[PDB]
Design a protein around this ligand. Structure first.
Ligand SMILES: *[C@@H]1O[C@H](CO)[C@@H](O[C@@H]2O[C@H](CO)[C@@H](O)[C@H](O)[C@H]2NC(C)=O)[C@H](O)[C@H]1NC(C)=O
Ligand SMILES: *[C@@H]1O[C@H](CO)[C@@H](O)[C@H](O)[C@H]1NC(C)=O
Ligand SMILES: *[C@@H]1O[C@H](CO)[C@@H](O)[C@H](O)[C@H]1NC(C)=O
Ligand SMILES: *[C@@H]1O[C@H](CO)[C@@H](O)[C@H](O)[C@H]1NC(C)=O
Ligand SMILES: *[C@@H]1O[C@H](CO)[C@@H](O)[C@H](O)[C@H]1NC(C)=O
Length: 274
């Protein structure tokens, strides 16, 4: 019941905030009632196994925000003994060392995992993150996954295949160039796909047909360097026909120079040349 030093607590809101206080470790005496825990703006460095494990357990803790706390290492079992944990945010931490077992018929309770801007200053980083996502099949109930701003070069096919509860996937502000060797064909449950601010030049017929087949999907494609040549014709025709693209009026050509900033929806065959 008390409230740890350097924290603010509310029994009524079941909320604990230990924010911008330069904590170097997770407080040991958190009250058992906590449902929402904010540990942002600190200097944690490393989160060890069982960093939140207590007796009695924090059995009500459902939302945990560790954003912007200079974490460079998250070790195996860091989140163990948190049977109610639904939402975890590790964004804006330079995670050089994310254990493959950081998050792991007995799946993790996690539903939402927010991992934006986790890439440390320049062993594949994307590979390390994917391993942590897929270890033990622990992330079965995961419905929302955010992986913005990570310098990722590819859309990881294994994540789409092996997290089939996913409803929301954010890969905005990465460096994706192509979707050619990834299939969206069977992603029934996928409701949102954020691909804004990548390096995509064009979408090909295969991709377009796959997306068109999904019952719930909303795709975000703004601020990519689209190339308005003859290879763009299928995508322009699709864009005119589709309802799955959000804010489709904003999509513009980056190249060639004579088409720069032209709206894709307005383009006709005579504009799309090679
Ligand atoms: C985790 O805590 C952070 C830090 O307070 C929240 O960060 C804010 O996020 C909003 C929406 O993305 C931004 O517009 C703010 O400017 C952010 N502030 C900072 C300092 O980064 C973040 O929303 C929290 N997430 C959850 C799920 O609690
Ligand atoms: C936390 O650390 C930074 C860097 O030393 C400092 O500027 C800041 O004042 C500290 N925060 C608090 C609340 O004292
Ligand atoms: C986009 O990504 C780059 C690379 O991670 C980053 O430095 C920048 O802050 C990001 N933009 C936003 C809005 O976060
Ligand atoms: C969806 O299709 C991919 C191949 O494109 C396959 O690996 C994956 O298992 C499929 N998903 C399900 C739920 O069967
Ligand atoms: C319905 O709308 C909400 C808010 O726009 C969204 O989160 C959800 O993904 C949508 N659901 C489906 C099934 O499209």
């Amino acid at each position: 019941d008390q409230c740890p030093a350097l924290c603010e607590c509310s029994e009524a809101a079941r909320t604990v905030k230990c924010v911008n206080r330069n904590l170097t470790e997770v407080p040991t005496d958190l009250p058992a009632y906590v449902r929402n825990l904010f540990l942002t703006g600190n200097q944690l460095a490393v989160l060890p196994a069982g960093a939140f494990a207590r007796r009695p357990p924090l059995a009500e803790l459902a939302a945990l925000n560790l954003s912007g706390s200079r974490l460079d290492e998250v070790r195996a079992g860091a989140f163990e003994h948190l049977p109610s944990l639904r939402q975890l945010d590790l964004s804006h931490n330079p995670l050089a060392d994310l254990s493959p077992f950081a998050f792991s018929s007995a799946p993790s309770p996690l539903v939402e995992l927010i991992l934006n801007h986790i890439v440390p200053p320049e062993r594949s980083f994307e590979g390390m993150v994917v391993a942590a996502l897929l270890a033990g099949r622990a992330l079965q109930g995961l419905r929302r996954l955010e992986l913005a701003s990570n310098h990722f070069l590819y859309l990881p096919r294994d994540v789409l295949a092996q997290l089939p509860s996913l409803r929301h996937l954010d890969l905005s502000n990465n460096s994706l160039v192509s979707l050619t060797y990834v299939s969206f064909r069977n992603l029934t449950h996928l409701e949102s796909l954020h691909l804004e601010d990548n390096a995509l030049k064009v979408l090909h017929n295969g991709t377009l047909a796959e997306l068109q087949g999904l019952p719930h999907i909303r795709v975000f494609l703004d601020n990519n360097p689209w190339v308005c040549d003859c290879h763009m014709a299928d995508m322009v025709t699709w864009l005119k026909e589709t309802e799955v693209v959000q804010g489709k009026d904003r999509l513009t050509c980056a190249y060639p120079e004579k088409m720069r900033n032209r709206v894709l929806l307005e383009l006709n065959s005579a504009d799309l040349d090679c």
